[PDB]
Design a protein around this ligand. Structure first.
Ligand SMILES: [Ca+2]
Ligand SMILES: [Ca+2]
Length: 279
């Protein structure tokens, strides 16, 4: 399949070079996989989700996404126009309030919720969780992310937006998950992206068009936007049978575009997520 005039990040993850505009992908499109978006919620009624999104848990008064951030991330995972894995199932877990903030105890609870809830869901191609959130280092937060991964979920987490070493942020600093930095459409490390030895991969994160609340769309930037590209790529590759939840981060790193990015500090991987789709 080939989506013309796609958002630049979708085109980028199907090309060895920057500057293209078509997203080339296998039509299976993540069918049969499931992605939990652990965030401010998902506006499941958005036409771009085509009935494939639903809220499964909220830690606040409502399950509504009153912010937009979670809806945007979910759209990059799996919306029709803006998503990597256009046929995946999306499950929303609202651990962040409508200002985009959440206490670590609640974020931890949401991770352990996913680890259990996936045993209620029919996800024959496997389960992914996308965590476009974080704060300062916390061993408890890291341990929760490690448990979620251990339980059989491909966990992708944002590196953070501090232009600093991700070792000092959580869940970014948990080794066993997939820690995602951000790049721009000229293959530069995004100006805000964290870096460091703990990063596994980069994805598109500057000026990413996706869904928003009120049935709308907008373009925003962050490692929060790079993370769902990787989560959606994992779901897509799992549906194709190329990898598993335990091995997908390593597989994505194996198969990434290597050495394409600029302003990568020595000791940080120079790896950009790539679907290696060959029609
Ligand atoms: Ca290249
Ligand atoms: Ca890792």
């Amino acid at each position: 399949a080939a989506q013309t005039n796609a958002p630049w990040g979708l085109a980028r993850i199907s090309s060895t070079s920057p500057g293209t505009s078509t997203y080339y992908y296998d039509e299976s499109a993540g069918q049969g996989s499931c992605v939990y978006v652990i965030d401010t919620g998902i506006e499941a009624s958005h036409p771009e989700f085509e009935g494939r999104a639903q809220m499964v848990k909220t830690y606040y008064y409502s399950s509504r996404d009153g912010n937009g951030h979670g809806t945007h991330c979910a759209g990059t995972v799996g919306s029709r126009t803006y998503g990597v894995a256009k046929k995946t199932q999306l499950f929303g877990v609202k651990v962040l309030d409508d200002n985009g903030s959440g206490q670590y105890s609640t974020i931890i609870a949401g991770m352990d919720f996913v680890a259990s809830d996936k045993n209620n869901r029919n996800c024959p191609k496997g389960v992914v969780a996308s965590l476009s959130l974080g704060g300062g280092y916390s061993s408890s937060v890291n341990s929760a992310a490690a448990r979620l991964q251990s339980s059989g979920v491909m966990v992708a987490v944002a590196a953070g937006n501090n232009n600093a070493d991700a070792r000092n942020y959580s869940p970014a600093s948990e080794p066993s998950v997939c820690t995602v930095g951000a790049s721009d459409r000229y293959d530069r490390r995004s100006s805000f992206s964290n870096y460091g030895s703990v990063l596994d991969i980069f994805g598109p994160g500057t000026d990413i068009l996706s869904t928003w609340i009120g049935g709308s769309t907008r373009s925003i930037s962050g490692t929060s936007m790079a993370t769902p590209h990787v989560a959606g790529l994992a779901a897509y590759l799992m549906t194709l049978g190329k990898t598993t939840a335990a091995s997908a981060c390593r597989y994505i790193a194996d198969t990434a575009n290597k050495g394409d990015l600029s302003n990568i500090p020595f000791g940080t991987v120079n790896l950009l997520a790539y679907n290696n789709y060959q029609a």
